[PDB]
């Protein structure tokens, strides 16, 4: 999902449905290869010791001036018009150049 | 003439710095509801003697 050949935009993004697999976050949290690392809601240590229901992977490419709006409780040209996260967002945002 | 494009295009150049660099954003969404928790990793790493 990070080294994908093709992708979509920030408003017509393809939701990569992830199901029936073990989500190992050890190769993504402490890999020292992702520049933007935002987390909201809860700590990322609880994302590996507590089970959740639905996990979706929204893969899109956006610039750094509009990557700050992908957060609960923001505004702008993306957080109100293109892609908005819910207020009860207990996930993380991982991106790389 | 009278053909405006509100869907403006992005700009990605190698000469730009970290401000306009392409970020492969993958949003890790999580949600808890009345449905049983299924996809967060059903098993973990343990040990045995």
């Amino acid at each position, epitope marked *: 999902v990070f080294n994908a050949t093709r992708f979509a935009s920030v408003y017509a993004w393809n939701r990569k449905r992830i199901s029936n697999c073990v989500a190992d976050y050890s190769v993504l949290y402490n890999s*020292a290869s*992702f520049s*933007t690392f935002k*987390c909201y809601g809860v700590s*990322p240590t609880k994302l590996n010791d507590l089970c959740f229901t639905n996990v979706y992977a929204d893969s899109f490419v956006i610039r750094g001036d509009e990557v700050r709006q992908i957060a609960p409780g923001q505004t702008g040209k993306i957080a109100d018009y293109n892609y908005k996260l819910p207020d009860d967002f207990t996930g993380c945002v991982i991106a790389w150049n | 003439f009278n053909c405006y494009f509100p869907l403006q295009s992005y700009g990605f150049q190698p*000469t730009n710095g970290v401000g*306009y660099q392409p970020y492969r954003v993958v949003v890790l969404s999580f949600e808890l509801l009345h449905a049983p928790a299924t996809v967060c990793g059903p098993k973990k790493s343990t040990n045995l003697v």
Partner: antibody, heavy 118, light 108 residues
Framework: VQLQESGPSLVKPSQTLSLTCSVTGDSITNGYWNWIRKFPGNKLEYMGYISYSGSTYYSPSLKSRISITRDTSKNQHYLQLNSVTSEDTATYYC?????????????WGQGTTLTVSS | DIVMTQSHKFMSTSVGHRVSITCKAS??????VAWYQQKPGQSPKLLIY???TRHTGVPDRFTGSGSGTDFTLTISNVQSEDLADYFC?????????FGGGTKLEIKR
């Protein structure tokens, strides 16, 4: 490459802010040159940045009263803030936000202390 | 904002003593923790990127470690000319939130 800060240090409230930062040793062709102000007491706050193409973006602390311009002919860039008050009394610094060889480098300048009061 | 709250504001380190500056983050920022170096009479420059890799032109006596939330700077065999201010900040997204800072002193 050494950065040098300049500009006026006496700006009355409800006026137009104007600063000038000069870059010696590298033209405005690659990277970013941002604005970071310094409050008395080791308190730093981000203001904005601009590339060499002309497009800029503002900090979420201010809503719409900050505009950042650049100049590739004189290798300088300006900062403009409208409707200033006593909260803008800080020492503005200029940096160099550029990357290279899968790493990030940054260096600041001398800074110019600006006082907005009566 | 993710404020990089430091644990100590000052530390007495002699020539050759190991510097240990610990900054506690309220939110996990991964590994995008950088350090500054504000010398008296010089310009503040970035020293350590990704909490382990030094800046170009700087000798290998400045290094460190850290993972997730507990980031601790480790300067082995420091000298008297390295008396500067070390700040804790982030570079993952805009705006860049800065902390208080730690000023070193030569133990005499």
């Amino acid at each position: 490459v050494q950065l040098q800060e300049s500009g006026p240090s006496l700006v009355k409230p409800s006026q137009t802010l104007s600063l000038t930062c000069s870059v010696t040793g590298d033209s405005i062709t690659n990277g970013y040159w941002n604005w970071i102000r310094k409050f008395p007491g080791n308190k730093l706050e981000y203001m904005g940045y601009i590339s060499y193409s002309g497009s800029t973006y503002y900090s979420p602390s201010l809503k719409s009263r900050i505009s950042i311009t650049r100049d590739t002919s004189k290798n300088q860039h300006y900062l403009q803030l409208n409707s200033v008050t006593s909260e803008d009394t800080a020492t503005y610094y200029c940096a160099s936000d550029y990357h290279g060889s899968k790493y990030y480098f940054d260096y600041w300048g001398q800074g110019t202390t600006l006082t907005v009061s009566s | 904002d993710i404020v990089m709250t430091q644990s100590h504001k000052f530390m007495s380190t002699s020539v050759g003593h190991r510097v240990s500056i610990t900054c506690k983050a309220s939110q996990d920022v991964g590994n995008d923790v950088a350090w500054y170096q504000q010398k008296p009479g010089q310009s503040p420059k970035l020293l350590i990127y990704w909490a382990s890799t030094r800046h170009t032109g700087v000798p290998d006596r400045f290094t460190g470690s850290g993972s997730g939330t507990d980031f601790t700077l480790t300067i082995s065999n420091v000298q008297s000319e390295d008396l500067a201010d070390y700040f804790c900040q982030q570079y993952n997204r805009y705006p860049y939130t800065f902390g208080g800072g730690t000023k070193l002193e030569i133990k005499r």
